[PDB]
Amino acid sequence: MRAIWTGSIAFGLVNVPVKVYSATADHDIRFHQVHAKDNGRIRYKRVCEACGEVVDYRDLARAYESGDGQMVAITDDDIASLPEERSREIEVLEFVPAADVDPMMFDRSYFLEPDSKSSKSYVLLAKTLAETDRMAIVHFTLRNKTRLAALRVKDFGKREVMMVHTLLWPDEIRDPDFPVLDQKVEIKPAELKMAGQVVDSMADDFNPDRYHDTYQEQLQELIDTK
Amino acid sequence: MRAIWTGSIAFGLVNVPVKVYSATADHDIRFHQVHAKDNGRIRYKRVCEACGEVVDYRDLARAYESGDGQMVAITDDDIASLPEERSREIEVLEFVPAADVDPMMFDRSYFLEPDSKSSKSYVLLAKTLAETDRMAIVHFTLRNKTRLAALRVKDFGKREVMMVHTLLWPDEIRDPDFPVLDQKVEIKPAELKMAGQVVDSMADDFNPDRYHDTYQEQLQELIDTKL
Amino acid sequence: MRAIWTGSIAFGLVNVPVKVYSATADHDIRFHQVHAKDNGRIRYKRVCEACGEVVDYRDLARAYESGDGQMVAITDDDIASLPEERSREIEVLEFVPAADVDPMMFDRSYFLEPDSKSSKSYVLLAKTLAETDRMAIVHFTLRNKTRLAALRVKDFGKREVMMVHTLLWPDEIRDPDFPVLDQKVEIKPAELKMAGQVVDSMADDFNPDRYHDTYQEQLQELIDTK
Amino acid sequence: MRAIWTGSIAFGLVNVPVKVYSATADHDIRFHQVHAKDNGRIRYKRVCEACGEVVDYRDLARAYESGDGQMVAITDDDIASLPEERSREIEVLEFVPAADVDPMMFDRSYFLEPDSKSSKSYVLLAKTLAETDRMAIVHFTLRNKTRLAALRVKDFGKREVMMVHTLLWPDEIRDPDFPVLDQKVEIKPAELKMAGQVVDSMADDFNPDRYHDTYQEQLQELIDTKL
Amino acid sequence: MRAIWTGSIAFGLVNVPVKVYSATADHDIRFHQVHAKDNGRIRYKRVCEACGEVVDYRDLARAYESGDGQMVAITDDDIASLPEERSREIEVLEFVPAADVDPMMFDRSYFLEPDSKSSKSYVLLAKTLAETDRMAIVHFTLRNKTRLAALRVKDFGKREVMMVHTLLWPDEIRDPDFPVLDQKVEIKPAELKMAGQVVDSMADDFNPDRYHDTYQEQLQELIDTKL
Amino acid sequence: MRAIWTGSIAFGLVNVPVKVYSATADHDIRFHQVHAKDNGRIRYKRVCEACGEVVDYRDLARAYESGDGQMVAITDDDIASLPEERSREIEVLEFVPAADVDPMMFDRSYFLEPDSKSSKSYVLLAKTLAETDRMAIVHFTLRNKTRLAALRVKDFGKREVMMVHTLLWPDEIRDPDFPVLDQKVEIKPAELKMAGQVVDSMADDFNPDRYHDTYQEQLQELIDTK
DNA sequence: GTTTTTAGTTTATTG
DNA sequence: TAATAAACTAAAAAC
DNA sequence: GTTTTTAGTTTATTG
DNA sequence: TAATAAACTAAAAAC
DNA sequence: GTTTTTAGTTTATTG
DNA sequence: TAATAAACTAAAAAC
């Protein structure tokens, strides 16, 4: 439970230093390679296929899997050139309505809170964002990696906190084609009514606490065995 | 156009056949390590820290690394002990309005491809879901792994496609334990309106197409330059 | 052994693939024609009477006799007008108690089969039918033709199997208006007692094993000796 | 409206007169063909293939094709050998409980009818059959052909008349070989009860009045238009 | 010349069809009254004693005469009251050994005519009755009249047919007592043998050919001579 | 009840004068045609067809109606000439076995009683016939009318008496010509057993006292009413 | 290729 | 004597 | 084109 | 002296 | 100075 | 089969 990195968002003149904190962390139990004879850890290493010898990662240059399979040498100049990656401060670009954004845009989120002991400006920003209902957007960066992001505030039982989302690039989504789907189909009003009552009978409330990972429960039992 | 997964919605007796296709593809291209000296691709191998000797991935066991350092190879029966492990069909549990589910749980997303023979049933299901406007929370199986997910109706105009979103586990969202905001804060209505005036002056609607990634453009330029 | 068609029950959401099969095949020896003198198989070719010569089957035109025998001019378009042909799935309409159905219209029979690996809904529907003990009336379709048919289950001991029986149209059945049986009838107890005695004397159980198509067996001996 | 047959039930001494009737006459319009360009009704003609010449029907030789299709010479006397064709009385073999027979063996139905002289015996036999509620497996005969058949009573609203339906030879019925269905299947309670509720929702009584052959009505109206 | 009566046996439900033919007819030549003087046959016209007037068949009413001498007109409606009187078919009540019924009660004989289409039941009834050899006592109704009768199997060298014999009512037979034979009679064995030897000496089997109507023969000869 | 006549039975030299008593008499109610309005008996006179005039029996000469219809005159001399009819006694002609005589042959009977006060001969003949069972046949005559007859022994409930039978002439029996039944037939042993068992079920004891003339019983009851 | 089902003829039987 | 059932081909469809 | 009831003769022998 | 129990007759309907 | 937490690969299996 | 599980490693800031 430690901050990933510092954050300074420059909203006009008034900049709020905000510290980010991970909102999630894998529930699954993480294992590592253990040879039965060894009963010890196993680690990979960069072994050159043409050379046939172990090499260090620094010597090796990352290459994209080109269709031609030709050689590529990663150069830090490309990434270093961009100023967004260098800028450790948070960047505010626009506010967009919550209804405008759809489920897809959300990928990952983290909490947000102000570094300074004065949570005033943060409180006003969160409250005005809630009133306007225009989720703010940020070209967020981390470890010299920029990425579009969005802001939202949620009221927990004890308190309310503003927080961020990891926003996928809209170009990335690939709309599908289902030629069979577009074929015309008719619906029977009686069949419609039957479907409605069936779903209502199956319909119920929301029970997040009831949902559980049977696989993770088995993992918990296994670790109890260990 | 690549069918990642196939099956059928095993909801009760509905068993509407469906094919699953990955909804979104990452713009970035996976990288394979290469050494400028070697002038070719590179493939790693595995050596222990106590063997000091290369051991193929097959002989290595999947054992947890506990704090005590004890490591026990994972039992295969326990791996497959889940009754739903075999499943090759998406299974439904419940239905609920969308507002009930919290967006944070959303992790990944796939599209659902129906079949002509059952096209009537799928279309009717989509219509009833749209009318009731009530999301559906459904178990999910994929390459011998279970994952919790929900599905909803999405419209591409006259084309409307049902889709599934992988949902993060309930316990995954960790609450914040923060004293910094536990201190009481007072808000001035004058400053509230002063901030809101700008908040609404610079406000604009969603423009997903307008935004572009400079990093991907630089990557494409590098790819062109190297070939 | 071969399938007739391959459709899928269509009851609202329920869509369980089915591979219908021919319940009963007529094993009676079918008897070809051969010219006695030529000893060659015969072939039917059609000579139009008023024409005076043969006519191709496609050219042959279809007409109607209205009791008076007068012909009628017809076109394929009107036949195509009806939409029943498009039905290539077994639409379901309504269920009925097994007792209600009458045993004089079970014209022909057809089994069902599971095609998709998802047999679960199949067996679930079969068990629901068996428990409720209500037949299902299904608008069976076949070869651009529709025959109102019953849907029912008959546990074969080894494994429950769902069956569909093609039902004669209720309009087809005729309720004979006999003028004789209405006449008043009187019976004394002695004759009824005698009838019960004789019936119980002849009473026994169905014996499928002891039943053989004597004619078919003898003609099979014939066919063998030749 | 005309009888198809006459005879008597040759069981024991009962020998009640019977006037068999056609249970179900197919009202569906059978649709003759006439050559269009001339408007002349077409007649077939039997022609020898090698000869390419018409042949009398009697001169035709009935033949059978072996598993390889090879012909088989066959003579009338051999068919005449079997005597059961002669029997012109509906003998009786046994009486069986009504529920014993499956609802799939019998396809075609046939009514029965007495002659004024001995209507009393007919009615008494019908009443005894109704009371005992056990069918009669009658070794029906017809048109030099013998067909196993069942005998029961279907009391009409006003009168009770015994009926006979031709019964498929239990040899003809084919059992199913369903290796796929042999696969073990599983069921859960909630889905089962939901499906039962749905079925009960669909529950309803037989409605012969509302049931019609849409195609027959439409085509009949069409021909009415033509005339 | 034709059948006297027709109708199927009404045995329970057995109801074997049959028709009745007069077994025997008088051999004597029937005579018709005539007057030699006027060369004309004679009709009979009936009148009362007080009327002295011609009264036709219709205007003549039936009546009964009592010992007191009073007269009661017969009511035709009550005559046919009993259900059996309206029967148009022979009916059987019970069976009995042949010897049980006395030979005294035998008025008339009749033959039975089988039915071609149902002759099997008729023949089988004949055979079973012959095997058991138990003459069946059966009611009998014809010409609006009722009579007792029994049916017996009689076999001709080439034919075997049941035959119904009119049975005299038991009430008709009467047994007046005679004191003449009430006197005790004693006959010695010597006289017994003396009589029996002659009795067996002149005794011979039936000679039906020898027995014949001599008077009818003479009358027929005279008639032929006149004709 | 009085003897019809006193016919003496002649055999060799020993003759037993024996009276004849009617062994039967119809119990039907007696009816005389009576005019309703008159309520008196009805008598008929015999009227000439051509003459239209009443003719008495004495004036009437009997003749037979041949197919021509012409008179066939008959004289009483021919009937009177027969010695048998003149005789007022009964003469035995042959002794025939009782099993020999068929139930057809006799159609009416009359009790036979001894006229002589000494019934020695009568009882002796009765015993001889009973032991020998050689039915005594006689050319019996009544009213100058001769008919073949047989004389039988019956043991009454107290004693044993002799009665005569009216034997129809052997020519009278008409052998039927029924070619239909001459056609052959097969019998099923199972059906044979069923028929035999049915007969046994219906088989019972002789019940002469039961059989009552329901028609004549109704007539008697009506007379009792009137 | 293959079976199976459907649409009409003929052809013959029963009354 | 026309209604009806039985044998049959051809043809068309579904797989 | 019958063949069997049936009242009324008609008789004939009987207590 | 009167009775009545059996043949002849046609009347009449039935089939 | 040490840790965790995450992005980047980077294999490796599987519909 | 490329997507996805499983794991290695870079770095990265946090106290």
Query: Does strand H come within 7 Å of the CB of C31?
Result: yes
Pairing mode, strands A8-11 and E71-73: unpaired
How is residue A177 written in tokens?
Answer: 């084609």
Q: Are A124 and A76 in contact (CB under 8 A)?
A: no
Nearest CA to CA, how far is C188 from chain F (Å)?
15
Under CATH, which architecture does the E1-26+81-172 domain have? Beta Barrel (2.40)
Class of domain C7-24+82-167: mainly beta
Give CA–CA dist B84/C54, Å, rounded: 68
Question: Which chains lie within 8 Å of chain B at 3 or more CB pairs, if any?
Answer: A, C, D
Nearest CA to CA, how far is D168 from chain B (Å)?
35
CB neighbours of residue B52 within 10 Å? 8
> Which DSSP string do the residues of E65-133 spell out, in sequence order?
E-TT--EEEPPHHHHT-SGGGG--S-EEEEE--TTTS-SS----EEEEE--GGGHHHHHHHHHHHHHHT
3-class DSSP assignment, residue F147:
strand
Give CA–CA dist A159/F1, Å, rounded: 137
B contacts of A23 (beta carbons < 8 Å): 104, 173-174
Give CA–CA dist F119/F104, Å, rounded: 31
Side chain identity at residue E55, one-letter code: V
Give CA–CA dist E22/E4, Å, rounded: 6
Q: Are E203 and F95 in contact (CB under 8 A)?
A: yes
Give CA–CA dist C222/C224, Å, rounded: 5
Measured distance between the N- and C-terminal CA atoms of chain D, rounded to whole angstroms: 26
Packing angle between helix E119-132 and helix F189-202, nearest 10 degrees? Answer: 60
Give CA–CA dist F9/F116, Å, rounded: 12
Give CA–CA dist A140/A90, Å, rounded: 6
Give CA–CA dist B107/F98, Å, rounded: 120
3-class DSSP assignment, residue C99:
coil
> Which DSSP string do the residues of A197-214 spell out, in sequence order?
HHHHHHB----TTT---H
Asked if B58 is an interface residue toward chain A (Cβ–Cβ < 8 A), one would say: no
Give CA–CA dist E121/E119, Å, rounded: 6
How is residue E213 written in tokens?
Answer: 């109507």
Phi and psi at residue E145, to the nearest 5°: -115, 150
Decide yes or no: CATH 3.40.630.30 for domain F1-26+72-172: no
Collect all residues with Cβ–Cβ distance below 8 Å to B193 and sequence separation of at least 6.
Answer: none
Q: Are D17 and D97 in contact (CB under 8 A)?
A: no
Q: How far is CA D15 from CA B78, E7, E113, in A?
A: 76, 14, 16
Instruction: Give chain A's radius of gyration (CA, Å).
Output: 25
Give CA–CA dist A2/A19, Å, rounded: 10
Nearest CA to CA, how far is E65 from chain F (Å)?
6
Asked if F83 is an interface residue toward chain E (Cβ–Cβ < 8 A), one would say: no
3-class DSSP assignment, residue D23:
coil
Pick the residue of F191, F198, F204 with the most C CBs within 10 A to test the interface with C by mutation. Answer: F198
Asked if C77 is an interface residue toward chain D (Cβ–Cβ < 8 A), one would say: no
Query: Does strand H come within 7 Å of the CB of D22?
Result: yes
Closest residue (CA) to C1' of nucleotide H15 is C5
Residue carrying structure tokens 């990928």 = A107
Nearest 5°: the CA angle C69, C74, C78 is 135
D contacts of C65 (beta carbons < 8 Å): 32
Q: How far is CA F79 from CA B102, C219, D6, E220, F88, in A?
A: 137, 77, 59, 13, 15
Give CA–CA dist F226/F218, Å, rounded: 12
Residue carrying structure tokens 């019609």 = D212
Domain residues of chain C, as ranges?
7-24+82-167
Three-state SS annotation for chain B: CCEEEEEEECCCCCCEEEEEEECECCCCCCEEEECCCCCCECCCEEEECCCCCECCCCCEEEEECCCCCCCCECCHHHHHCCHHHCCCCCCEEEEEEHHHCCHHHEEEEEEEEECCCCHHHHHHHHHHHHHHCEEEEECCEECCEECCEEEEEEEECCEEEEEEEEECCHHHCCCCCCCCCCCCCCCCHHHHHHHHHHHHHCCCCCCCCCCCCHHHHHHHHHHHHHC
Residue carrying structure tokens 């071609």 = E116
3-class DSSP assignment, residue C223:
helix
Pick the residue of D13, D15, D89 with the most F CBs within 10 A to test the interface with F by mutation. Answer: D13
Size of interface D-E (CB pairs under 8 A): 54
A contacts of B178 (beta carbons < 8 Å): 113, 159, 161
CB neighbours of residue D151 within 10 Å? 23
Give CA–CA dist B144/B87, Å, rounded: 8
* Nearest one of B1, B209, B7, B9 to B126, comparing CA atoms: B9
H or E element at residue A223: helix A214-225
Burial category of B196 from C-beta neighbours within 10 Å (exposed 0-12, middle 13-18, buried 19 and up):
middle
CB neighbours of residue B211 within 10 Å? 16
Give CA–CA dist F85/E214, Å, rounded: 11
Under CATH, which architecture does the B3-27+72-172 domain have? Beta Barrel (2.40)
3-class DSSP assignment, residue A42:
strand
Reduced DSSP (H G I as helix, E B as strand, rest coil) percent helix, strand, coil of chain C, to 5: 20, 25, 50
How is residue B50 written in tokens?
Answer: 């106590």
H or E element at residue E151: strand E145-155
The answer for C 181-200 residues in CB contact with F (under 8 A) is 194, 197-198
Q: Are D48 and D55 in contact (CB under 8 A)?
A: yes
Nearest CA to CA, how far is D7 from chain C (Å)?
17
How distant is C1' of J7 from CA of E154, in Å?
31
Beta bridge pairs of residue D138: D149
Q: What are the CB-based long-range contacts (under 8 Å, 24+) for C84-88? A: C84/C141, C84/C144, C84/C145, C84/C146, C84/D214, C84/D215, C85/C144, C85/C145, C87/C139, C87/C141, C87/C146, C88/C5, C88/C7, C88/C141
Q: Are C20 and C5 in contact (CB under 8 A)?
A: yes
* Nearest one of D157, D115, D111 to D17, comparing CA atoms: D115
Packing angle between helix A120-132 and helix B189-201, nearest 10 degrees? Answer: 60
Asked if A201 is an interface residue toward chain D (Cβ–Cβ < 8 A), one would say: yes
Q: How far is CA E204 from CA D57, E201, F98, in A?
A: 73, 8, 11
3-class DSSP assignment, residue D41:
strand
Asked if D42 is an interface residue toward chain C (Cβ–Cβ < 8 A), one would say: yes
How is residue C61 written in tokens?
Answer: 């035109």
Quick one: how far is CA B114 from the chain centroid? 21
User: Which residue stretches of chain D are H helix?
Assistant: 76-81, 119-132, 179-182, 189-202, 214-226
Pairing mode, strands A61-64 and B31-34: antiparallel
3-class DSSP assignment, residue D24:
coil
The secondary structure of residue C83, as a DSSP letter, is S
> Which DSSP string do the residues of D88-143 spell out, in sequence order?
-S----EEEEGGGS-TTSEEEEEE----GGGHHHHHHHHHHHHHHTEEEEE--EET
Under CATH, which architecture does the D7-25+82-167 domain have? Beta Barrel (2.40)
Q: Are D199 and C135 in contact (CB under 8 A)?
A: no
Q: Are E74 and E66 in contact (CB under 8 A)?
A: no
Under CATH, which architecture does the A8-26+79-167 domain have? Beta Barrel (2.40)
Give CA–CA dist B22/B16, Å, rounded: 19
Q: Are F204 and E96 in contact (CB under 8 A)?
A: yes
Residue carrying structure tokens 């012959």 = E130
Q: Are E63 and F98 in contact (CB under 8 A)?
A: no
**Which nucleotide has its C1' atom closest to residue E63's CA?**
I7
Hey, what's the torsion of the CAs at B89, B95, B99, B101, to 10 degrees?
-50
Give CA–CA dist B102/A121, Å, rounded: 27
Phi and psi at residue F223, to the nearest 5°: -60, -45
Hey, what's the torsion of the CAs at F175, F181, F185, F191, to 10 degrees?
-90
How is residue F34 written in tokens?
Answer: 């009576």
Beta bridge pairs of residue E149: E138, E166
Give CA–CA dist D70/D75, Å, rounded: 17
User: Of how many residues is chain B composed?
Assistant: 227
Resolution in angstrom units:
4.1
Quick one: how far is CA B124 from the chain centroid? 27
